């Protein structure tokens, strides 16, 4: 009952070494391992499709059969490194294989990762939510028996259990240096929140990381992982063993269709001057008035351009707007417009997500009493948008952490000895009614809500909307209200309403969503003419600051820079136009000067 030779594994191990023997061919993989030797890491990365090219059969065997095939490949890798350099190979107990390239059907998402892929390689894509602490895991424990003068081993691998006494009951003292340990971390992936239907339940998939793969991930990172999906011992829990992890850029790209691109290009080229206002009017058509607000909200979705400097200064491109206004005004309605339209937005309340709240938090699992650093709403909106309602009712700790993320777009945490620093760059669109209703237009907005005089400085814009009891204004609104209410769809007999569904000039919201998604990729840059013009205006606001809203300050200057940047993105104009600075300046004047 002791295996002697495996012809299949022999051939498979040989074929991998032949594949890694990239000398007569283009030399790419020989150069890789040479770089691997120089770089001192022990995990080669491999494009699966090249393996398909050299051997489709073996590549099929690898994808269909993971655990055995990789073990052969690691063997071929270790021998190959030993061929190039024996001593460097001898430094490391083992070596690892990293897969890459196109995975035809094995490239799935956590929603679509069914049990059918068990023991098959899978290339999952998603967002990391829960992270566990780095821990060292024993694999090969080495023991010494002074009674017998004997040294033994015990591997664990996939497999009271710890041996401490000889079979003769002599003591065994472990040999820590001889034994083998490896850092080990667990995380959880979920489907990207933008592309995740509300009807379906969450489908979260565990992940195991070891060796250098441990720390190459944090919560709120858009990552693609390639690994072997395996069950666990007992209805069985199932986990994915990572073979390689890579952080896809959160920018990604606006795939869509070329027809959408062409329609966008035609629409953009149609009327670049009115595209901003045409979008603005069609941004929230159900809502009447608040035209500056609609213009402002469009700029927030467009977003400025983040500037990372030589010293590491990281002037944010995100724009932040706060809405204050009397109840029964279309504030909550406006945000739901943003949720329907924003390419990547997350809703939230004052209280935030359960337990974790708005920002990240540490969570004992309570199934094993294990710490888990769990991403919050703010982090998940990174390079996106967050819509906060009842923002006044935000808790005090959140009122503390909001300062960090607003200042830095970055939430740090050291609680429970868990050092971490999560990217949280996210334009925020907060809304909060005045306390006790009936805003007094005498004191500060802080005096009506209590924002501690700082977050108002942090917010680039702050718009007040009061229920002025003008009969003309009420007629305009009520005319709009009844016009929408009286509307019936084109195909209908003024009879039945819509069925009780079991599932959840003017431009389409989706068309708007696709358009602004395309526009976000544009990277418009300054013009000296506009730069001179805006400097005059900012100084002019400082001149207009003599009368005494918050005063114009350097925060206001960069706010105008982002707004002109935003309007530049609206027209796809890679050079900021004086029109862009013009529209921003008047918009800011409305914000501070009614």
């Amino acid at each position: 009952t002791v295996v002697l030779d495996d012809v299949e594994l022999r051939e498979a191990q040989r074929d991998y070494l032949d594949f890694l023997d990239d000398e007569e061919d283009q030399g790419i993989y020989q150069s890789k391992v040479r770089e691997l030797i120089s770089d001192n890491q022990y995990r080669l990365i491999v494009n699966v499709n090249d393996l398909r090219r050299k051997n489709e059969k073996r590549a099929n065997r690898l994808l269909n059969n993971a655990f055995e095939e990789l073990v052969a490949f690691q063997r071929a890798l270790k021998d190959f490194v030993a061929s190039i350099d024996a001593t460097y190979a001898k430094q490391y107990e083992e070596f690892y294989v990293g897969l890459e390239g196109s995975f035809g059907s094995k490239h799935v998402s956590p929603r679509t990762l069914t049990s059918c892929f068990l023991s098959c390689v899978v290339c999952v894509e998603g967002i990391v939510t829960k992270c566990s602490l780095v821990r060292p895991k024993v694999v090969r424990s080495v023991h010494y028996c002074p009674a017998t003068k004997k040294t033994i081993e015990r591997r664990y691998s996939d497999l009271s259990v710890y041996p401490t006494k000889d079979e003769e009951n002599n003591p065994l003292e472990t040999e820590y240096g001889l034994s083998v340990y490896k850092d080990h971390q667990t995380i959880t992936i979920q489907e990207m929140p933008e592309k995740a239907p509300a009807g379906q339940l969450p489908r979260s998939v565990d992940v195991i990381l070891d060796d250098d793969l441990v720390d190459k991930a944090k919560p709120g990172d858009r990552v693609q992982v390639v690994g072997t999906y395996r069950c666990l011992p007992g209805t069985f829990r199932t986990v994915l063993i990572a073979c390689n992890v890579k952080q896809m850029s959160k920018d990604a790209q606006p795939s869509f269709s070329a027809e959408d691109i062409a329609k966008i290009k035609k629409f953009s080229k149609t009327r670049s001057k009115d595209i901003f206002d045409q979008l603005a009017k069609s941004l929230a058509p159900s809502i009447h008035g608040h035209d500056y607000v609609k213009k402002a909200i469009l700029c927030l979705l467009l977003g400025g351009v983040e500037r990372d400097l030589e010293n590491g200064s990281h002037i944010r491109g995100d724009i932040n707007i706060l809405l204050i206004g009397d109840p029964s005004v279309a504030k909550s309605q406006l945000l739901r417009y943003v949720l329907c339209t924003a390419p990547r937005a997350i809703p939230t309340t004052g209280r935030g997500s359960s337990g974790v709240g708005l920002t990240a938090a540490v969570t004992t699992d309570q199934e094993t009493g294990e710490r888990r650093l769990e991403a919050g709403a703010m982090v998940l909106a990174d390079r996106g948008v967050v819509c906060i309602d009842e923002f006044d009712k935000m808790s005090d700790m959140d009122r503390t952490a909001i300062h960090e993320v607003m200042e830095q777009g970055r939430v740090t945490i050291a609680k429970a000895g868990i050092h971490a620093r999560l990217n949280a760059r996210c334009s925020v669109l907060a809304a909060a009614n005045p306390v006790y209703g009936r805003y007094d237009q005498y004191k500060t907005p802080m005096e009506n809500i209590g924002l501690q005089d700082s977050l108002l400085s942090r917010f680039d814009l702050l718009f007040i909307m009061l229920d002025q009891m003008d009969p003309e204004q009420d007629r305009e609104i009520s005319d709009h209200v009844l016009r929408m209410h009286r509307y019936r769809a084109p195909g209908e007999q003024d009879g039945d309403a819509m069925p009780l569904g079991s599932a959840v000039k003017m431009v389409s919201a989706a068309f708007m969503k696709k358009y602004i998604h395309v526009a976000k990729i544009i990277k418009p840059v300054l013009t000296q003419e506009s730069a001179t013009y805006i400097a005059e205006e900012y100084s002019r606001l400082r001149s207009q600051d003599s009368m005494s809203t918050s005063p114009v300050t350097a925060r206001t200057l960069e706010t105008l820079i982002r707004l002109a940047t935003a309007h530049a993105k609206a027209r796809m104009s890679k050079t900021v136009d004086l029109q862009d600075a013009e529209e921003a300046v008047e918009l800011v004047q409305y914000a501070y000067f009614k």
């Binding site: 060292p136 820590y176 490896k182 050092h419 620093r421 005063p551 350097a554």
Partner: protein
């Protein structure tokens, strides 16, 4: 792979037969002398330099490096055998333990084959302890770099002690006496906890089956001094985009009470696992301590230093993205170099920056924090605490021999205001969570930044009227700069033009002098700290003349400008600080006058 008995021979050869030509070239069997001291209880610990073993067996040092817990026991048992040879006096029975050990040895010698259980453990044949000192070849390892692969090895690290528990007695060899038989029972302990024994395994009671129930006795048992502490990544090694990372360290024996929170120490010890299960066991790690030591260019650099605008250029290099505030940028540089502390005198130069929002206060502090060697950033914990029972130094403690940048100074807790008041007074922090006034050394410059209440500053409203901070506490500061965002269309246009360049270039506009890299700046500072310039008594005459002159202006000034002896003392610090910038060990009139100019400008900022 190798025979530990053979290794035991090599160490015994090494210890007995290693010597070093000591002071005056005295050929002395260093360890041989120490063994003689140990034999007579004149030593307790035996620190061993691995480089001594490297002097004649580097391979043995390597095997010690790849596994250290094994070689520690080998050496300990090796020393255990050698000591009876080197005994030459029957020294007094220091403490009950030795006479107890003597009593047991006579009993054992009163016995001939014997089962391994009926023999004393090695750990009880002790009252000596052994530790290694890492080789100079082994470069110190950052706490981040101590991965799972290095467990079981011997590593040297650097860091800052964030906390340390009180000394407590750790048990080593639990001793018991049977209920109804004279045989004594032992139990070595490795785990942090254990089940105490119940029934004696004594041969007599085992044969008799009398159920001789073990009763623990502390006198028979053997304890050891023990401590628990955490060490944090030193600020230099931390990457900018990360934060410091901790590591537990266990200290025992004579290594205890050689460390306090906020001590920038270097530790050599074994990195090992502890367990207070998925695909294998998951175990928390720690670093068993062996040795603890509390730690402390090109000609063009000299040519640059000789330049008159050198120090001015360095001031321009302070946050070149920040347009304006040039004289303030000069002042920050003075804080970074600090004083001299000639004798003692407060070398740290604490500065507070009050001003309207949106004037680069917070950004300046961030730059200073990134720049200084030992740096802390806080807003307000800040001060020490007693967590549960263990001390835990706050950011103020961690800033020792450095700077603590406190943004949002206006929103401090009033108790903390008192705390920093103690720091600016004597540079120590006192705290009593359980009525125990534990004082901690806090020698750290304070770079405060506040914002006036109710929007921007009102010039009509006096000082301590736009701000609600203690005027006495404010006057303690060496310098106090009031930054006002007055609408000045020309200067406003200048700043905007600076901003638009940065957006259009991701780069500062070109100045007369390009900024220097922060590391190079720190190198100049470290050079500047090398000096301790002195004040000639002739300068004192002119210095005092200037002081009474400005003090007269304060009397002439209707508003009390807080001129006092405190004002004079800081001026001494500024002058000698400038002398350090000049790299001249004697202060000069230019240094003095320039310091007065900045002092006047700070007062002018109160205009």
């Amino acid at each position: 792979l190798k025979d530990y008995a053979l290794e035991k021979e090599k160490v015994k050869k090494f210890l007995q037969e290693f010597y070093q030509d000591d002071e005056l070239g005295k050929k002395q069997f260093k360890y041989g002398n120490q063994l003689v001291r140990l034999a007579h209880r004149e030593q307790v610990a035996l620190y061993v330099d691995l480089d001594d073993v490297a002097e004649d067996d580097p391979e043995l040092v390597d095997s010690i490096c790849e596994n250290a817990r094994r070689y520690a026991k080998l050496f300990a048992d090796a020393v255990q055998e050698l000591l009876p040879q080197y005994k030459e006096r029957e020294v007094v029975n220091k403490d009950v333990l030795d006479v107890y050990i003597e009593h047991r040895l006579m009993m054992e010698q009163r016995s001939m084959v014997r089962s391994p259980q009926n023999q004393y453990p090695a750990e009880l044949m002790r009252r000596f302890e052994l530790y290694f000192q890492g080789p100079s070849s082994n470069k110190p390892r950052v706490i981040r770099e101590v991965r799972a692969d290095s467990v079981g090895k011997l590593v040297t690290v650097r860091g800052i002690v964030t906390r340390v528990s009180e000394v407590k007695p750790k048990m080593v060899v639990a001793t018991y006496t049977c209920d109804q038989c004279g045989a004594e029972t032992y139990q070595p302990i490795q785990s942090p906890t254990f089940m105490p024994l119940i029934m004696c395994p004594s041969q007599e009671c085992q044969t008799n089956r009398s159920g001789g129930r073990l009763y623990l006795q502390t006198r028979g048992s053997r304890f050891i001094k023990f401590q628990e502490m955490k060490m944090q990544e030193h600020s230099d090694q931390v990457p900018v985009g990360n934060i410091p990372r901790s590591i537990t360290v266990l200290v025992e024996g004579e290594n205890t009470r050689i460390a306090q929170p906020g001590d920038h120490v270097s530790v050599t010890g074994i990195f090992l696992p502890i367990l207070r299960v998925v695909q294998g066991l998951l175990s928390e790690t720690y670093l068993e301590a062996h040795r603890i030591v509390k730690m402390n260019l090109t000609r063009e650099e000299l040519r640059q230093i000789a330049e008159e605008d050198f120090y001015e250029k360095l001031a321009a290099s302070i946050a070149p993205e920040i347009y304006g505030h040039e004289d303030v940028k000069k002042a920050l540089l003075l804080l970074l170099v600090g004083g001299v502390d000639q004798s003692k005198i407060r070398g740290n130069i604490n500065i507070c920056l009050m001003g309207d929002p949106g004037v680069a206060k917070s950004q300046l502090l961030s730059y200073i924090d990134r720049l200084a060697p030992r740096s802390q950033y806080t807003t307000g914990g800040l001060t020490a605490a007693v967590l549960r029972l263990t001390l835990e130094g706050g950011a103020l403690v961690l800033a020792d021999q450095g700077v603590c940048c406190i943004d949002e100074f206006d929103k401090m807790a009033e108790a903390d205001r008192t705390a920093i008041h103690e720091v600016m007074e004597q540079q120590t922090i006192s705290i009593a969570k359980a009525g125990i006034l534990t004082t901690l050394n806090a020698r750290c410059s304070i770079l405060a930044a506040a914002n006036p209440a109710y929007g921007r500053y009102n010039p009509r409203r006096s000082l301590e009227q736009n701000i609600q901070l203690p005027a006495a506490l404010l006057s303690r500061f060496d310098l106090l700069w009031l930054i006002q965002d007055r609408p000045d269309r020309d200067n406003d246009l200048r700043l905007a033009q600076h901003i638009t360049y940065v957006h259009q270039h991701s780069r500062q506009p070109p100045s007369q002098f390009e900024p220097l890299d922060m590391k190079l700046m720190r190198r100049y500072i470290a050079m500047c700290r090398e000096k301790q310039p002195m004040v000639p008594e002739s300068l004192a005459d002119y210095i005092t003349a200037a002081y009474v002159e400005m003090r007269r202006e304060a009397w002439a000034s209707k508003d009390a400008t807080y001129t006092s002896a405190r004002t004079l003392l800081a001026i001494l610090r500024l002058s000698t600080a400038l002398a350090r910038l000049r790299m001249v060990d004697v202060v000069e009139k230019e240094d003095v006058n320039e310091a007065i100019r900045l002092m006047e400008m700070s007062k002018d900022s109160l205009l």
